[PDB]
Design a protein around this ligand. Structure first.
Ligand SMILES: C/C=C(/C)C(=O)O[C@H]1C(C)=C2[C@H]([C@@H]1OC(=O)CCCCCCC)[C@@](C)(OC(C)=O)C[C@H](OC(=O)CCC)[C@@]1(O)[C@H]2OC(=O)[C@@]1(C)O
Ligand SMILES: Nc1ncnc2c1ncn2[C@@H]1O[C@H](COP(=O)(O)OP(=O)(O)O)[C@@H](O)[C@H]1O
Ligand SMILES: [Mg+2]
Ligand SMILES: [Mg+2]
Ligand code: NA
Length: 994
């Protein structure tokens, strides 16, 4: 029964055909279980290890490498000679990377928990029911509970399903619904029906929600829903139906692979087309088999050369580093790829209480009626100092301190504040300051009583623990609190019934003290208190009261106002039914207006500045609050969201106003709105949907399982460090301090991390471009391989990985937050930059091919064959060049390859320096601007010499130490790269501005 809350207790029994004293019969249990299933959320997909492992091979690039591993594995097999010592090295290396690669991937999935499986923490293992086949109650597994079951719950129990309370055994029943309604304070439940069929959970006072806890009491009820049909199960279904896209970088990264894959095949076709002349050679002769090997061999080098094998690890290292940095600033990022999206945040939706404000309540003003003589009228306004919950402060009249006792009206004001209050104070000897015990609003009233001290007590005679609740205790001893009529959003008021302490045999002298929202409370007042006397409430005086309330709640004071009243002649105790909260308003009528207290929940001290940063960064800020519209707007003006005197009629809505707009208009309202007051439980999600229909990167805050859907949907869900574990697991980030300004600081950190990432990414991909040209040039000219797979891999993983990582630590621009949000569609490389890397690539390709070619010719140590043709052949099966001797297989010399690799390494240590800045010359921004970079280069070169001299290695890499002469030819070919890019940068700065 989805509508149970609106049904009478009897109608629910009738609906299910069950008796409240016996429960369901075994036949009913059978049929019901059959019809509704078990009371549990479905179990998550059985993603097995094998499936997991296979998934680490879905990527196009990992497939290419896999293929190349196979070819490499085949060649290191169908070859002639016993040089097997360095045969299977190449294939094992590739495979080893893919292996370690899959390992990591799997390691993550094993430690990644999802929010949905986190909801299963709120479902108890057992529940208690009454079934016809037994007199006493029997506890069974909660999953075996079904709609119709008569259930029993008691204090300490975790509610097993959504239940319609049938009968409350205890004096009252209290429930902790924090996880679902935010209401941290336990709420009283009743059994009467709640008329509205569309009432939100907070108002279903006759319902117990599965996953919730009994704070106090014992009750009997009937199960209305179970499984995914409960409030929490519906939350679980929204979440499961929410798909989160890949981050902008993942999308670009994936398109890069699709394109890289398309290029590799095209370069293979080209290498083939350029050698179509082989069909013009005689059939007999020539090593066909030793030719196909040549082609397959370059394919392997081709694939290894185009893939930036070390990129994923570089990104991850930068993200982990930045992430630990963000933590020190109170931003706990859960998803590494989220740091990127964070920098892109274009809209931040923030709850007010506790994030934009401190949630530290404090009464600042209050007033009573001074005189009412016909059309004439005067009030008695006061101020109170102290913003802490500590009883340290004073009352003032026109800044002049006064004594509260000299005004009777204040004595009663204080009485109401003390009595009609379920909160208190507690001096924490540990921390050294007073803390609240209950809701912040009521505690502020408690704190106010101590500051007022309407009876003058020896408080300065008591300790710090006794000072806490002194003046309250005094007023407590003068009035006996019979019972209290709880607050309910319908009437927006609360009251307590009291009778004097010292009163003999008599049935007269009782009073009701009412506290609540002004509008409603004042409308039920027929009298106004003037000191100790009373007079009939009039139109004039009412307006006077309401004008001040409006000023306080809507002016720059942004105060939350409460009207305090007292029913002088409260109905006889026997004539009141304390069970139907629906009658409480009628009982709180014919009241006498006593006063108004205005309290403040102060903005965080850093919120003002952070909001300004957002305006500077082009980041829109939307506040979500429970304040009525007026005060919401006033607060938005106060903190900077709205201009002090700007029009906002069309930029602020309550949930009601928003629901009344047609779908088309809601979408529009979301693009311009900055204030949402009294918002429904589904609104955050709809607001995120509309915002996304404008391609906005949205950050949204939340804390309870009810915010879980919007958190998951938003590009950057933000959870409170003091919030629920479910909200956290559904968010990309957690605020350890719950402070709004932590979001802004994370965004900035996000913008900085990405700029540096843009650099080391272009750096790495840049080098792959040169490698492919080198492998291409060699393949086109039919030259001996200048660079082999193992060398490239060492370069792309180690040699270049260090500088790349170092670049991650590039100092951030100073105008980071003075620029609008970066567009997600912004490519990493295009336009003039694409040309620059086109050029650098050609350069690197020619430089490495030419470097090996050099040794093979114009060099001493090498077969000085100037303008000779290595291209001519590579078989000596004809021997045209050599005229006398016994040597041929020298084309496989390590020296030439060592020349190419050294050129690569040197041009890359150079191009890294060219990477410190996109367009700024090394003249303007010196290499030493990043010390890590310089140092990384020193380590890379050292590692280079390492693989050249430490015997085991030079064999594996096929390298040979160079002569001081050769090294200089490397510097003759490399160093000039800096000048090339310098010239291209110069062009971007002077002939490309506007
Ligand atoms: C890794 C090495 C190579 C050589 C490769 O094929 O990269 C191409 C490629 C896939 C792209 C290109 C490369 O295209 C070329 O170099 C043109 C063909 C000439 C080479 C042929 C030799 C005979 C990038 C590398 O070229 C230059 C010169 O900068 C730039 C950019 O890449 C990025 O922005 C990186 C995204 C993370 C991409 O055009 C990109 O495709 C896209 O979708 C983009 C938008 O991504
Ligand atoms: N404990 C209370 N007792 C009586 N009235 C209250 C209490 N708390 C709030 N009110 C009033 O009722 C209105 C709405 O309360 P509530 O729904 O709890 O709002 P909020 O989420 O801003 O705390 C408030 O504007 C306030 O004036
Ligand atoms: Mg909440
Ligand atoms: Mg509240
Ligand atoms: Na999200």
């Amino acid at each position: 029964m989805e509508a149970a809350h609106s049904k009478s207790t009897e109608e629910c029994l009738a609906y299910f055909g069950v008796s409240e004293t016996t429960g369901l019969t075994p036949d009913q249990v059978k049929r019901h279980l059959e019809k509704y299933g078990h009371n549990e959320l479905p179990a998550e997909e059985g993603k097995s290890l094998w499936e997991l492992v296979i998934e680490q091979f879905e990527d196009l690039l990992v497939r290419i490498l896999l293929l190349a591993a196979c070819i490499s594995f085949v060649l290191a097999w169908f070859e002639e000679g016993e040089e097997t010592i360095t045969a299977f090295v190449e294939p094992f290396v590739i495979l080893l990377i893919l292996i370690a690669n899959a390992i990591v991937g799997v390691w993550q999935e094993r430690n990644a928990e999802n929010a949905i499986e986190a909801l299963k923490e709120y479902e108890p293992e057992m529940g208690k029911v009454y079934r016809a086949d037994r007199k006493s109650v029997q506890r069974i597994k909660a999953r075996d509970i079904v709609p119709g079951d008569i259930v029993e719950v008691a204090v300490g129990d975790k509610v097993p399903a959504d239940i319609r309370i049938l009968s409350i055994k205890s004096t009252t029943l209290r429930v902790d619904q924090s996880i679902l309604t935010g209401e941290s304070v336990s709420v009283i439940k009743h059994t009467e029906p709640v008329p509205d069929p569309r009432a939100v959970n907070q108002d279903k006072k006759n319902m117990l929600f599965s996953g919730t806890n009994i704070a106090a009491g014992k009750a009997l009820g009937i199960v209305a829903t179970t499984g995914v049909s409960t409030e929490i199960g519906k939350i679980r279904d929204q979440m499961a139906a929410t798909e989160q896209d890949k981050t902008p970088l993942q999308q670009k990264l994936d398109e890069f692979g699709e394109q890289l894959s398309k290029v590799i095949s095209l370069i293979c076709v080209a290498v083939w087309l350029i050698n179509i002349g082989h069909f013009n050679d005689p059939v007999h002769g020539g090593s066909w088999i030793r030719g196909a090997i040549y082609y397959f061999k370059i394919a392997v080098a081709l694939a290894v050369a185009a893939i930036p094998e070390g990129l994923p690890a570089v990104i991850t290292t930068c993200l982990a580093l930045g992430t630990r940095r963000m933590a020190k600033k109170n931003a706990i990022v859960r998803s590494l790829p989220s740091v990127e999206t964070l920098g892109c945040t274009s809209v931040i939706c923030s709850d007010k209480t506790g994030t934009l404000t401190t949630n530290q309540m404090s009464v600042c003003k209050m007033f009573i009626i001074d005189k009412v003589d016909g059309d004439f009228c005067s009030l008695n306004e006061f101020s109170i100092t102290g913003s802490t919950y500590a009883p340290e402060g004073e009352v003032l009249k026109n800044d002049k301190p006064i004594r509260s006792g000299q005004f009777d009206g204040l004595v009663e004001l204080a009485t109401i504040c003390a009595l009609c209050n379920d909160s208190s104070l507690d001096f924490n000897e540990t921390k050294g300051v007073y803390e609240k015990v209950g809701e912040a609003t009521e505690t502020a009233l408690t704190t106010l009583v101590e500051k007022m001290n309407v009876f003058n007590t020896e408080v300065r005679n008591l300790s710090k623990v006794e000072r806490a609740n002194a003046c309250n205790s005094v007023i407590r001893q003068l009035m006996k609190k019979e019972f209290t009529l709880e607050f309910s959003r319908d009437r927006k008021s609360m009251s307590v019934y009291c009778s004097p302490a010292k009163s003999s045999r008599a049935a007269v002298g009782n009073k009701m003290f009412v506290k609540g929202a002004p509008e409603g409370v004042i409308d039920r007042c027929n009298y106004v208190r003037v000191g100790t006397t009373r007079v009939p409430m009039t139109g004039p005086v009412k307006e006077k009261i309401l004008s001040v309330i409006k000023e306080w709640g809507t002016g720059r004071d942004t105060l939350r106002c409460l009207a305090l009243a007292t029913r002088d002649t409260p109905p006889k105790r026997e004539e009141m039914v304390l069970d139907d909260s629906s009658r409480f308003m009628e009982y709180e009528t014919d009241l006498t207006f006593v006063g108004v207290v205005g309290m403040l929940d102060p903005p965080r001290k850093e919120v003002m500045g952070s909001i300004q940063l957002c305006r500077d960064a082009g980041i829109r800020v939307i506040m979500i609050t429970g304040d009525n519209k007026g005060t919401a707007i006033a607060i938005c003006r106060r903190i900077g969201i709205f201009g002090e005197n700007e029009e906002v009629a069309d930029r602020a809505y309550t949930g009601r106003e928003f629901d009344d707009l047609p779908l088309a208009e809601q979408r529009e309202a979301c693009r311009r709105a900055c204030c949402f007051a009294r918002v429904e439980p589904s609104h955050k999600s709809k607001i995120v949907e509309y915002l996304q229909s404008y391609d906005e990167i949205t950050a949204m805050t939340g804390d309870g399982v009810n915010d879980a859907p919007a958190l998951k949907k938003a590009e950057i869900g933000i959870a409170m460090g003091s919030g629920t574990a479910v909200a956290k697991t559904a968010s990309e980030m957690v605020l350890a301090d719950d402070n709004f300004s932590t979001i802004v600081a994370a965004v900035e950190e996000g913008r900085a991390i990405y700029n540096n990432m843009k650099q080391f990414i272009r750096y790495l991909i840049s080098s792959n471009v040169g490698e492919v040209v080198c492998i291409f040039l060699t393949a086109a000219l039919g030259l001996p391989e200048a660079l082999i797979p193992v060398q490239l891999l060492w370069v792309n993983l180690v040699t270049d990985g260090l500088p790349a990582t170092a670049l991650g630590f590039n100092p951030p621009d100073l105008d980071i937050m003075d620029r609008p949000p970066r567009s997600p569609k912004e490519p990493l490389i295009s336009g003039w930059l694409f040309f620059r890397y086109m050029a650098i690539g050609g350069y690197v390709g020619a430089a490495t091919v030419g470097a090996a070619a050099w040794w093979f010719m114009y060099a001493e140590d090498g077969p000085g064959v100037t303008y000779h043709q290595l291209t001519h052949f590579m078989q000596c099966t004809e021997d045209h060049p050599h005229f006398e001797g016994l040597d041929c297989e020298i084309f496989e010399a390590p020296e030439p390859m060592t020349m190419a690799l050294s050129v690569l390494v040197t041009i890359e240590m150079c191009n890294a320096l060219n990477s410190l800045s996109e367009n700024q010359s090394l003249m303007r921004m010196p290499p030493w601007v990043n010390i890590w970079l310089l140092g990384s280069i020193c380590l890379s070169m050292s590692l280079h010499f390492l693989i050249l001299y430490v015997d085991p290695l030079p064999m594996i890499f096929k390298l040979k130490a160079l002569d001081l002469t050769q090294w200089l030819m490397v510097l003759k070919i490399s160093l000039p790269v800096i000048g090339l890019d310098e010239i291209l940068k110069f062009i971007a700065r002077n002939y490309l501005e506007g």
